[PDB]
Design a protein around this nucleic acid. Structure first.
Ligand SMILES: [Mg+2]
Ligand SMILES: [Mg+2]
Lengths: 106, 167, 197, 122, 61, 127
RNA sequence: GAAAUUGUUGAAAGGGAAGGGCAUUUGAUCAGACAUGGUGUUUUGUA
RNA sequence: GAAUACUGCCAGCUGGGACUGAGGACUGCGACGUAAGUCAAGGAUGCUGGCAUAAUGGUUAUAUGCCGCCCGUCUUGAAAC
RNA sequence: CCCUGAAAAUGGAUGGCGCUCAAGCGUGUUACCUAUACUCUACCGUCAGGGUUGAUAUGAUGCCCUGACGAGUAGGCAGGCGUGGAGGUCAGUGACGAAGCCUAGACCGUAAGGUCGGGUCGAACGGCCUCUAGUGCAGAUCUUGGUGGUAGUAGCAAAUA
RNA sequence: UUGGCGGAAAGGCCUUGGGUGCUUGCUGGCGAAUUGCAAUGUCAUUUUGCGUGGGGAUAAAUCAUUUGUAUACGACUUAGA
């Protein structure tokens, strides 16, 4: 067809933070479509990929991926907490990111 | 001397590990996976394609087929955590899937010397595929539009919420 | 969900719209706000004129040129209210603010596009009926904006052209609705009705 | 080293405003340039492709005198001399080409994808 | 935080393993620490503690 | 070829540097504790440099081990090298910096015969 | 033949200082493990 | 004559998610079993894939998010005009 | 509750933007955010309580088991790192290159520090057990010596040319 | 390709005619495997350079000299085949 998307779009909002101290080890993700923790409970444990590009070709590609997963819900509005192998570079606040449907329970 | 000595040397004998208590009970699959279910492949080379599930294998994998005449997916095994069990059900009674096992799919592992600088199929595999898919498509021809459904790919459109969608 | 969101600023409250839009930019949504002369501020016109005069008094004593700049256009008043809510002195704030452009009227890039509203910042949905409000264009031309009438003339011309568009669109959609109704009650129509479409 | 010197129109060639005419420095530098051209023709160079490839100036040891200031004080009056060196070379052709081999590492999935593309197209 | 009712990390204040470097005294305290550990008689513990003592705590008899 | 060990973890892989060693050239970056009465580093304010303490100490099963898994032992000649004959899987030899090349070839030959790992088998070598 | 301080070359950043801490992107640069004993001799210098 | 709400209990069942795997022959307390034995019972094992190299990682420069006032001294109190 | 009463000097502060059935005031119910605090786990150290001379191989100040604890100026104590020189030892290193110096190269230690590779260089130096002291610097309007910014700046204008 | 309309930042919208390709509106035939149980598994647009081969066009500014409607110096205003 014309669409081939097998993931859900999301936005990298910020790190986990207090009013004046942030914590880069936990990122905050807005998954689009979900507006409550009860709907966000479907997406727990799903893999997340941040997909970006670079000028230098490394192993056949100019596209590099950072992997992570959803761990828990955050707040009352469907924001989730996500942890990555290496933390997200904080210039990606507001950048798009992919939530895959695996590991599936359905 | 440059360094004097250590007064005691540590022993070089490696100890044995303790006797473990982790036996292997078999995998308890989720309830939506019954044989004959149409699955959607979430990842892999054939991602977004709808296949039919036949047999639960020994290494917790699912035996699936396209059929190969419909969408070009051969006889294959997939992971149960990388599929979506749709509610669409066909009957796979009349297919002899006990031939396939974990030794049926062997990669014939490659040596470190054989490096592909720049750049085939088992005849047993191809007539096994031809035996099973002609038994599947006879069950496919009963209810309408299943051949078209299995040939078409799955993809998420704008406005599709997977937490609200029923498959 | 959208590449660019075009917001019709008419009938909106300035602070509530700015707090919606600033969070949208910080999340990464591109926003363009049109018809900035029709924003509303709650309160009397005399109260908001006194507020702007209190703001207008404030300037650097030894050199007025480096003081706070008192911008007079309604779009720049909205930009001031929004820059107050974005942390504009950082690179993240600058990158957010470059996803925004605010206009008086609807310019020709956006007069053929779709305008949306924000229902949690609409005056008729937020204020109690009876409370007094202002129009940002009237306040801005009271404090020194020079282009209130040329925007009105351009908006009159644009509305005439848009009504000429809408008459043809309404005639076409009535033809399409007539054909859909006559091509309903067939077998595919009843099967789609059973399946929910 | 240009703070509080005068401004001039002849810096428009170099996009500056502050420029001067250091006659003694020009005399010493052009004497060294003449000597280097003489060394080049003695060595047997082309004498038409020469450009000044290297030049540097750094500080020699100072030469000190005395200055007499009010209320009977002494201060220094020091000359800051120079060490100058320069190298003229012939302007040659393009330098080099034929960079590194850049051996590639591909996974089995990448190799299967490239083989699939090569099969699926011509 | 703990509301401590005592001084944390304090030594017991009783001298063990005597401060002398006499090798025969160290052999004697090795023998008597074996005896005090395993013979379950109070005499061995008493003489083991008396072996640690300094000179002014060992007056002549 | 080393003895099996747990995963080596460094609690603080960054070097502890003296406060204002970046600021002044007279202040070397060898660690000194701030004994000042108003020192923000001594008072442990947020956003300042961290100080060495006993909590950063390495695991006793992991301490003094190279990433290869051995402990470095400095050697000067063949008789010093021969002390690691029965302890090859725990210690690795390192030739001292002041050994000549014609002795270094002898030590490398004897270590290769005895199966001993040398951590610097490239010093003063000519090619 | 050190440092302060300086010249040239190279790399990098720079909207009213610079420098630092935690974390990661990007660029540059770099260490370690990769044999192992092994059924085995498909073997040459026959062990 | 019932139901339901509210509160409380179950040595009732069951689904999803995250972090951790310390220890290293055996010894103990137990459970299921007539027994042999088995086990979730004094701390993780089983199966599989890719790569085997700057890919992970270390160092360093830069960028970004948040934080970070100049040290020493006297002083009740120092970033101190 | 709101309003009058209610006047100060650079321009100005519910923290700012702004907010009017509030994003104000009174009150109630839930959900949610996060401290170096609490719970569980790992690791480091300290303290305490114990086990273990049996043969083989070492270290009994050793090895092992268990539990609790960890802020700190003035100050006290303990264990260590480094320097000049001395007794002993390694029949130590070295003109096939000692010492020193440079090195956004590598390794070890929580740290003081130690080790290696490369460059430069040219004649002595080191590990361990002990002994000894003119033994560790950022400051003292410290001492001696050297060098900056200021800065190609102030200026080089009395006595007729 | 024909005809319009659009100046707020028009740079886009509509329309006439023919060509050409596809059509999943409906019914068929062949292909796909081996990427081995996943690895973004690579499909976008931004700027520049260098080659082709096809058009298009053949300037000024500054220094120096000069002016004094200007001027500390720069700058400004003039003149000069
Ligand atoms: Mg004078
Ligand atoms: Mg320094």
């Amino acid at each position: 067809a014309e669409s081939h998307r097998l993931y859900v779009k999301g936005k990298h909002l910020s790190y986990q933070r207090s009013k004046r101290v942030n914590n880069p080890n936990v990122s905050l993700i807005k998954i689009e479509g979900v507006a409550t923790p009860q709907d966000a409970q479907f997406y727990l444990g799903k893999r997340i990929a941040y997909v970006y590009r670079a000028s230098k070709e490394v192993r056949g590609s100019k596209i590099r991926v950072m992997w992570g997963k959803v761990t828990r819900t955050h707040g009352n509005s469907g924001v989730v907490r996500a942890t990555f192998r290496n933390n997200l570079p904080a210039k990606t606040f507001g950048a798009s990111v992919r939530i895959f449907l695996y590991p599936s329970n359905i | 001397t440059a360094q004097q000595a250590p007064k005691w040397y540590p022993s070089e004998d490696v100890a044995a590990p303790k006797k473990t208590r982790k036996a292997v009970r078999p995998q308890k699959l989720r309830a939506s996976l019954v044989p004959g279910t149409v699955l959607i492949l979430l990842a892999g080379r054939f991602r977004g394609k709808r296949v039919v599930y036949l047999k639960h294998l020994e290494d917790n994998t699912l035996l699936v087929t396209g059929p190969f005449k419909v969408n070009g997916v051969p006889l294959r095994r997939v992971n149960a955590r990388y599929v979506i069990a749709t509610s669409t059900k066909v009957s796979v009674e009349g297919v002899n899937v006990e031939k396939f096992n974990v030794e049926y799919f062997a990669k014939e592992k490659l040596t470190k010397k054989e490096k592909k600088e720049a750049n085939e199929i088992k005849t047993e595999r191809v007539e096994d595929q031809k035996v099973v898919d002609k038994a599947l498509l006879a069950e496919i021809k009963k209810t309408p539009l299943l051949k078209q459904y299995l040939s078409a790919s799955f993809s998420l459109k704008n406005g599709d919420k997977p937490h609200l969608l029923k498959f | 969900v959208e590449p660019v969101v075009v917001i019709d600023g008419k009938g909106h409250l300035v602070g509530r719209l700015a707090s919606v839009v600033a969070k949208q930019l910080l999340n990464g949504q591109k926003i363009v706000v049109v018809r900035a002369e029709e924003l509303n501020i709650s309160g009397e016109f005399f109260r908001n004129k006194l507020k702007y005069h209190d703001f207008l008094r404030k300037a650097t004593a030894f050199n007025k040129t480096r003081g706070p700049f008192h911008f007079r256009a309604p779009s720049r008043i909205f930009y001031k209210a929004l820059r107050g809510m974005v942390s504009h002195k950082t690179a993240r704030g600058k990158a957010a603010l470059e996803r925004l452009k605010v206009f008086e009227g609807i310019p020709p890039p956006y007069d053929k596009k779709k305008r949306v509203v924000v229902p949690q910042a609409l005056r008729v949905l937020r204020l109690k009926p009876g409370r007094k409000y202002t129009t940002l264009g009237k306040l801005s031309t009271s404090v020194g904006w020079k282009y209130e009438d040329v925007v009105a003339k351009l908006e009159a011309k644009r509305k005439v052209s848009s009504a000429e568009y809408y008459a043809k669109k309404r005639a076409f959609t009535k033809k399409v609705a007539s054909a859909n109704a006559t091509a309903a009650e067939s077998d595919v129509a009843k099967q789609l009705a059973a399946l929910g479409y | 080293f240009n703070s509080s010197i005068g401004r001039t129109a002849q810096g428009k060639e170099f996009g500056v405003t502050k420029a001067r005419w250091p006659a003694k420095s020009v005399k010493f530098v052009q004497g060294l340039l003449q000597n280097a051209a003489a060394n080049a023709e003695a060595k047997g160079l082309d004498a038409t492709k020469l450009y000044v490839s290297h030049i540097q100036v750094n500080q020699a040891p100072k030469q000190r005198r005395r200055t007499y200031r009010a209320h009977g004080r002494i201060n220094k009056y020091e000359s800051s001399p120079s060490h100058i060196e320069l190298v003229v070379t012939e302007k040659e052709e393009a330098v080099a080409k034929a960079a590194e081999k850049k051996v590639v590492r591909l996974t089995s999935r990448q190799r299967g994808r490239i083989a699939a593309q090569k099969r699926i197209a011509a | 935080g703990i509301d401590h009712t005592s001084k944390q990390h304090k030594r017991s204040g009783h001298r063990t393993a005597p401060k002398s470097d006499n090798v025969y005294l160290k052999l004697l305290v090795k023998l008597y620490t074996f005896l005090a550990r395993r013979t379950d008689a109070p005499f061995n513990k008493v003489v083991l503690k008396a072996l640690f003592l300094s000179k002014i705590n060992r007056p002549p008899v | 070829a080393s003895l099996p060990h747990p995963k080596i973890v460094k609690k603080h892989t960054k070097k502890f540097k003296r406060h204002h060693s970046d600021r002044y050239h007279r202040v070397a970056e060898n660690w000194r504790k701030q004994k000042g009465i108003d020192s923000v580093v001594r008072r442990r304010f947020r956003g300042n440099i961290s100080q060495p303490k006993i909590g950063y100490g390495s695991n006793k099963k992991t301490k003094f081990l190279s990433p290869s898994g051995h402990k470095t032992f400095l050697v000067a000649n063949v008789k010093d090298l021969e002390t690691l004959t029965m302890h090859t899987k725990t210690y690795a030899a390192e030739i001292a910096h002041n050994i000549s090349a014609k002795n270094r070839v002898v030590i490398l030959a004897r270590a290769k015969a005895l199966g001993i790992k040398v951590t610097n088998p490239k010093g003063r070598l000519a090619l």
